[PDB]
Amino acid sequence: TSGSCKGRCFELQEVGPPDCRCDNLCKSYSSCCHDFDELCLKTARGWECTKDRCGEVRNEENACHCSEDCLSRGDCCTNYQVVCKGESHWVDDDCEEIKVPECPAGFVRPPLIIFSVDGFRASYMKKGSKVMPNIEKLRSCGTHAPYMRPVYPTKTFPNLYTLATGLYPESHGIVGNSMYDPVFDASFHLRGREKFNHRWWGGQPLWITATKQGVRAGTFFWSVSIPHERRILTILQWLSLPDNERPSVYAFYSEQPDFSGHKYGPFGPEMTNPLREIDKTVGQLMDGLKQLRLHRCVNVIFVGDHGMEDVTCDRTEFLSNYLTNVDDITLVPGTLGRIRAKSINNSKYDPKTIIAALTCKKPDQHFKPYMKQHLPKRLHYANNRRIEDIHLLVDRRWHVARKPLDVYKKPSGKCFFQGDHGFDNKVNSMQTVFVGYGPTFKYRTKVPPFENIELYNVMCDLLGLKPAPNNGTHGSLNHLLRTNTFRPTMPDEVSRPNYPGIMYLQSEFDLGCTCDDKVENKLEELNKRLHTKGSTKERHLLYGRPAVLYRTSYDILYHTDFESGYSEIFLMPLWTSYTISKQAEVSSIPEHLTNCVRPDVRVSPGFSQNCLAYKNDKQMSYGFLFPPYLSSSPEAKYDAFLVTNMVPMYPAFKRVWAYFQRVLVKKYASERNGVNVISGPIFDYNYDGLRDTEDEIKQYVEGSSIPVPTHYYSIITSCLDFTQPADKCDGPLSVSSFILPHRPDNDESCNSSEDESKWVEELMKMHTARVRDIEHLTGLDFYRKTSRSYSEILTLKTYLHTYESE
């Protein structure tokens, strides 16, 4: 319909119908005024000043200007000062530290510009360095990480909306580039108009956070037909607006190098040019800022959404080769797989039969099926109705498809893609980039790799905003910044522990347990009391006891070899802590102690587990949190069989756990010069990544109130300087953790029929976790007493050990 864009080009506030629009998204909606192209998308004379244009009389038809009034008008070509005034390109100036913001009068805060690049793999920073001098200058003069970890799936929309919200895709709702919502009965796709509907997009993205708190924000989306040079000129024009109208945060988005990467693979010879072109665009922005005297005022973030892997048509696994009944399913295909029934509310569709037909069927099978609740917890990819129950994790370099006709399209199936992304977010080729440059970022500083969910908090800090609740750990990235507005502090402990002494006589217990412990001194009797009272506690609890951050009733139990926090509600430890030195020796469970379980005289029969329940439950067995194999003496070993150290374990899981405890702990202590281990149960029956309350538990040991954990964790800490033993470390710490699913079969591990040395450790690596992940799942807070700064501890708690090569 009707109206004009005269005096409205790239207006910031979008107008409602039936009035026509002139903002940077109007093209997407087909709702621009009829003169939008003519007035707002000028192209005459290209994007660069030449010597003969210098001082020209202003011609309003030109794309940009070289006339003398152009600085005052805000619309010079970005190279104006270089061609027409003897100025140097930004890239050609030496790095000079920006100690304080150097902003024109009227700038109330340094603006933030987010420059996002689609498909920019982390290793492009080294491999394309010779063709990206503007980017290489940002990177070396500012703050950079060797790589930034994306979220899963390593697709465009989930990651860019994660960047804007600090939320996992399960929480923000953009769980893929394609998705079907069974409540909406509608599908979201990269291409098309459904994605414009606000109903898909949850959380509070940065532009909304900013606006609600009185900080003006540019649009983060761009119509695809607006060329990059015009996006840049538009941002530079918005930056010349009056103080009261000017945004403080700006976003530029590039579809490259992703668009070429898909055609040519991540390192195709055709990739050099798209990298040169992105660099040139960075150059334009920086020259533009320098003309406006804003180059030592603005904070610039150069950030990618994901990397890019070599993927061709012939590396496609077809479901039709596994299932006889493939027309019964709908598959979301590609570098991940999501399966649901073709016919909604079809009662005779069995996910269990589909999973079974897809499990370990071909020796080199290039995907693994999972019920979504069994996916590695580090992916946080389950708590959303748009995530199908059945998920296929696809090997890097591979695709999955339903039938061959979906891939090999008529006439005779030519391929025409050599690159793709979307795989597991720990995969090297999916890693992407982060550089921060400006007064608020540090000068010439490397920082360790970190996750993109953390940036939202930092952007809010950069803008003086209070972040909406999100999945970052605020303070974990304080080390990126010259000046921090946020001072993290430890959460307050909610429940204080009881410290029970000996309160019960053996004959008060009727637990159906037995142990051969009657076997067989004044000197070694005070020593026993000392231990039960906390004398070895500084050895086994190295970083203070974990804080309990919810209301509950629990006891601290001390022993020679380990300390625990025992829950009277869940009838088992919430945590068990012990230190194993490089010198410690592994021993066996003596014959006469094979089935030994001992009542704990500090803990009431009524708050204890019982052996009878385990006897009666033909599916469920038990294991121990502190391992008897690692007892310091035959006498201390009796403590490991206390009923208060016992936890429910499926026989299939006991294979995993026993190998970890008997073989792997000692190997880690050898490799790391001692380790401290904290282990415990996790209950997450509604798969939301958060500690279950007792009324959420769906499974108990038969005929008891003993709840069955969904997972078991361990956090394994040592000295970063491994020349110092774990128990006498003066400096920073080193951690690796896992959250192992507690499953009644080893179907996940295709080699599980073999010896544990051939599969267990591979499983654990797959289920590697951050300390922070375990904290959410347990309501515990770790590392309460160290000699390290809290910001450093927050970084340590966000660390993920990925087991990739470098």
Ligand X SMILES: *[C@@H]1O[C@H](CO)[C@@H](O[C@@H]2O[C@H](CO)[C@@H](O[C@@H]3O[C@H](CO[C@H]4O[C@H](CO[C@H]5O[C@H](CO)[C@@H](O)[C@H](O)[C@@H]5O)[C@@H](O)[C@H](O[C@H]5O[C@H](CO)[C@@H](O)[C@H](O)[C@@H]5O[C@H]5O[C@H](CO)[C@@H](O)[C@H](O)[C@@H]5O)[C@@H]4O)[C@@H](O)[C@H](O[C@H]4O[C@H](CO)[C@@H](O)[C@H](O)[C@@H]4O[C@H]4O[C@H](CO)[C@@H](O)[C@H](O)[C@@H]4O)[C@@H]3O)[C@H](O)[C@H]2NC(C)=O)[C@H](O)[C@H]1NC(C)=O
Ligand Y SMILES: CC(=O)N1CCN(c2ccc3ncn(Cc4cn(Cc5ccc(C#N)c(F)c5)nn4)c(=O)c3c2)CC1
The first and second tokens of residue 81, run together, are 């000062």
Minimal distance, residue 185 CB to ligand X, in Å = 15
Task: Give the C-alpha separation, 271 to 17, whole Å.
Answer: 43
Q: Is 205 in the site for ligand Y (CB under 6 A)?
A: yes
β-strands 143-144, 445-446 pairing: parallel
Q: Is 258 in the site for Zn ion (CB under 5 A)?
A: yes
Residue 513's SS3 state is coil
Q: Is 384 in the site for ligand X (CB under 6 A)?
A: yes
Minimal distance, residue 157 CB to ligand X, in Å = 14
Minimal distance, residue 249 CB to ligand Y, in Å = 12
Residue 258 in marked binding region:
yes
Q: Are 472 and 486 in contact (CB under 8 A)?
A: no
Residues in binding contact with Zn ion, number by CB under 5 A: 1
The half-sphere exposure of 245 on its side-chain side, counting CA atoms within 13 A, is 9
Which residues, numbered 23-82, are part of the site for ligand Y (CB under 6 A)? 25, 28
Residues 442-481 as x/- pattern, contact with ligand X by CB under 6 A: --------------------------xxxx----------
Q: Are 790 and 776 in contact (CB under 8 A)?
A: no
Nearer to ligand Y by C-beta: 220 or 370?
220
Q: Which does 486 bind (CB under 5 to 8 A by kind): K ion, ligand Y, Cl ion, none?
A: none
Minimal distance, residue 407 CB to Cl ion, in Å = 16
Task: Single out the residue of 40, 167, 210, 292 in contact with ligand X (rule: CB under 6 A).
Answer: 167
Residue 756's SS3 state is helix
Q: Is 23 in the site for Ca ion (CB under 5 A)?
A: no
Which residues, numbered 178-217, are part of the site for Na ion (CB under 5 A)? none
Residues in binding contact with Ca ion, number by CB under 5 A: 9
Minimal distance, residue 759 CB to Na ion, in Å = 8
Q: Is 173 in the site for ligand X (CB under 6 A)?
A: yes
Nearer to ligand X by C-beta: 197 or 321?
197
Nearer to Na ion by C-beta: 425 or 746?
746
Task: Single out the residue of 88, 104, 196, 758 in contact with ligand Y (rule: CB under 6 A).
Answer: 196
The half-sphere exposure of 356 on its side-chain side, counting CA atoms within 13 A, is 6
Nearer to ligand X by C-beta: 610 or 710?
710
Specify the stretch interacting with Na ion by CB under 5 A; choose among 84-92, 456-464, 658-666, 739-747.
Answer: 739-747
Return the number of other C-beta atoms located less than 10 Å from residue 569's C-beta.
Answer: 15
Query: Residue holding tokens 């000295």?
Result: 719
State yes or no: is 316 an active-site residue: no
CA distances (Å), 179 to each of 210, 567, 633, in order? 29, 41, 57
CA distances (Å), 625 to each of 344, 514, 617, 669, in order? 44, 19, 20, 17
Residue 306 in marked binding region:
yes
The first and second tokens of residue 647, run together, are 């936890």
Give me the residues that bind K ion (CB under 5 A), please: 614, 617, 621
CA distances (Å), 107 to each of 74, 250, 411, in order? 16, 15, 60
Specify the stretch interacting with Zn ion by CB under 5 A; choose among 202-210, 243-251, 256-264, 786-794.
Answer: 256-264
**10-47 core/surface letters (b: 16 or more CB in 10 A; e: else):** beeeebeeeebbbbbbbbbeebbbebbeebbbbeebeb
Nearest to residue 301, comparing CAs of 148, 491, 153, 186? 148
Residue 264's SS3 state is helix
Specify the stretch interacting with ligand X by CB under 6 A; choose among 68-76, 379-387, 596-604, 707-715.
Answer: 379-387
Which residues, numbered 229-258, are part of the site for ligand Y (CB under 6 A)? 253
Q: State phi, psi for 475 to the nearest 5 degrees.
A: 110, -25
Q: Say which DSSP state 376 is in.
A: -
Residue 692 in marked binding region:
yes
- Computed over its alpha carbons, how large is the radius of gyration of the chain? 30
Is the four-CA dihedral 512, 516, 519, 525 of positive or negative sign? negative
Nearer to ligand Y by C-beta: 157 or 622?
157
Q: Is 282 in the site for ligand X (CB under 6 A)?
A: no
Q: Is 224 in the site for ligand Y (CB under 6 A)?
A: yes
Residue 688 in marked binding region:
yes
Task: Single out the residue of 383, 679, 717, 746 in contact with ligand X (rule: CB under 6 A).
Answer: 383
Residue 112's SS3 state is strand
Q: What angle do CA 200, 203, 206 make, to 5 degrees?
A: 115
Residue 711 in marked binding region:
no
Minimal distance, residue 671 CB to ligand X, in Å = 31
Nearer to Cl ion by C-beta: 189 or 482?
189
Task: Give the C-alpha separation, 232 to 144, whole Å.
Answer: 23
Minimal distance, residue 354 CB to ligand X, in Å = 23
Minimal distance, residue 654 CB to Na ion, in Å = 15
Task: Single out the residue of 223, 604, 670, 705 in contact with ligand Y (rule: CB under 6 A).
Answer: 223
Q: Is 561 in the site for Ca ion (CB under 5 A)?
A: no
Minimal distance, residue 688 CB to Ca ion, in Å = 4
Which residues, numbered 174-203, are part of the site for ligand X (CB under 6 A)? 202-203
The first and second tokens of residue 179, run together, are 């998705």
Nearer to Cl ion by C-beta: 11 or 389?
389
Is the four-CA dihedral 254, 259, 260, 266 of positive or negative sign? positive
Q: What angle do CA 545, 786, 788 make, to 5 degrees?
A: 150
Q: Are 29 and 196 in contact (CB under 8 A)?
A: yes
Nearest residue (beta carbon) to ligand X: 202
Query: Residue holding tokens 């152009």?
Result: 70
Task: Give the C-alpha separation, 706 to 626, whole Å.
Answer: 19
Nearest residue (beta carbon) to Ca ion: 156
Q: Is 204 in the site for ligand X (CB under 6 A)?
A: yes
Q: Is 549 in the site for ligand X (CB under 6 A)?
A: no
For the chain, the residue count is 806
Q: Which does 617 bind (CB under 5 to 8 A by kind): K ion, ligand X, ligand Y, none?
A: K ion
Which of 154, 156, 209, 316 is catalytic? The answer is 156
Residue 478 in marked binding region:
no
The first and second tokens of residue 417, run together, are 């893609």
Structure-derived torsion over alpha carbons of residues 238, 241, 245, 250, reported in degrees to the nearest 10 = 20
Specify the stretch interacting with Cl ion by CB under 5 A; choose among 84-92, 174-182, 267-275, 368-376.
Answer: 174-182
The first and second tokens of residue 457, run together, are 């908090």
Cβ-Cβ contacts under 8 Å for 483 (sequence gap 6 or more):
440
Specify the stretch interacting with Cl ion by CB under 5 A; choose among 11-19, 177-185, 498-506, 760-768.
Answer: 177-185
Nearest to residue 752, comparing CAs of 714, 743, 711, 739? 743
Residues 740-769 as x/- pattern, contact with Na ion by CB under 5 A: ------x--x--x-----------------
Minimal distance, residue 621 CB to K ion, in Å = 5
Residues 176-195 as x/- pattern, contact with ligand Y by CB under 6 A: -------------------x
Query: Residue holding tokens 């020209």?
Result: 56
Q: Is 173 in the site for ligand Y (CB under 6 A)?
A: no
In the chain, the amino acid numbered 253 is Y
Residue 558's SS3 state is strand
Nearest residue (beta carbon) to Na ion: 752
Q: Are 465 and 213 in contact (CB under 8 A)?
A: yes
Task: Give the C-alpha separation, 429 to 267, whole Å.
Answer: 11
The first and second tokens of residue 263, run together, are 């055609």
Given the rule CB under 5 A, which residues bind Zn ion?
258
Q: Which residues bind ligand Y (CB under 6 A)?
A: 25, 28, 157, 160-161, 164, 195-196, 198, 201, 205, 220-224, 253
Residues that bind Cl ion (CB under 5 A): 176-178
Question: Binding site for 1-tetradecanoyl-sn-glycerol 3-phosphate, residues?
Answer: 156, 177, 258, 421
Binding-site positions for Zn(2+) read 118, 156, 258, 262, 305-306, 421
Residue positions annotated with a catalytic role: 156
Residues marked as binding for Ca(2+)?
684, 686, 688, 690, 692
Which residues are part of a known binding site? 118, 156, 177, 258, 262, 305-306, 421, 684, 686, 688, 690, 692
